[PDB]
């Protein structure tokens, strides 16, 4: 219901690594995956980490239709690229 | 996208217990939470376990509108009650 973004992460096929987190904004979702990347150690290295080591899917809350919309991993990764280049 | 149900579980306020799972049916989602209950040990005991020890929220995929609809914990627990009484 409330949470703007629900993030679904996993490391390979291990069901024990399937961790979800709730975020009040896209910024908060981006800071979370940068956090995952930082604690488990460049744009190319960041993208490859989320293509080979971890997998992630954002579910974005559509307030008008009271529904969660799944978005592609590349959508969140592209927005993260815009955060990392600015900061 | 594909997964009929996404289950979000947690044990208290610990972010490390926030585990998600994907299910092809409501039956599969029910067998999963019965599994959680069985491995962490009656209708009254089952309901109280999911009201005090673990918390759970099902996200049900609406194929026509390509969206995940969050449902109340009681909705899944009520359906689980119908599975446990029959079996």
Author numbering:
A (entry chain A), B (entry chain A): 6 to 46, 55 to 100
Q: What does the publication say?
A:
Members of the ERH protein family are small proteins found in metazoan, invertebrates as well as plants. Closely related proteins, sharing around 30% sequence identity with human ERH, are also present in Schizosaccharomyces such as S. pombe and in few other fungi. Erh1 cooperates with Mmi1 to target meiosis-specific transcripts for degradation by the nuclear exosome. Erh1 not only suppresses the meiotic program in vegetative cells but also stimulates meiosis progression.
Larger crystals could be obtained by increasing the drop volume, varying the ammonium sulfate concentration and the buffer. From one of these crystals, we could collect a dataset of better quality from which we could determine Erh1 structure by molecular replacement using the structure of human ERH as initial model and refine it to 1.95 Å resolution. Erh1 monomer folds as an α-β protein composed of a four stranded anti-parallel β-sheet and three α helices packed onto the same face of the β-sheet. This fold is similar to that of metazoan ERH (rmsd values of 1.1–1.9 Å over 80 Cα atoms). Three copies (protomers A, B and C) of Erh1 protein are present in the asymmetric unit. Protomers A and B are virtually identical (rmsd values of 0.27 Å over 84 Cα atoms) while protomer C slightly differs as illustrated by its higher rmsd value when compared to the two other chains (1.3–1.4 Å over 84 Cα atoms). The largest differences between protomer C and the two other Erh1 molecules present in the asymmetric unit occur at helix α2 (2.5 Å translation along the helix longitudinal axis), at the hinge between helix α2 and the N-terminal extremity of strand β3, and to a lesser extent on helix α3 (1.3 Å translation). Among the three copies present in the asymmetric unit, protomers B and C associate to form a tight homodimer with a butterfly-like shape while the protomer A forms a similar homodimer with a symmetry-related molecule (rmsd of 1.1 Å over 160 Cα atoms). In the homodimer, the Erh1 β-sheet face from each monomer, which is not packed against α helices, interacts to form a β-barrel. Each monomer engages an area of 850 Å2 mostly formed by hydrophobic residues, which are strongly or strictly conserved within Erh1/ERH orthologues from fungi, plants, insects, worm and animals.
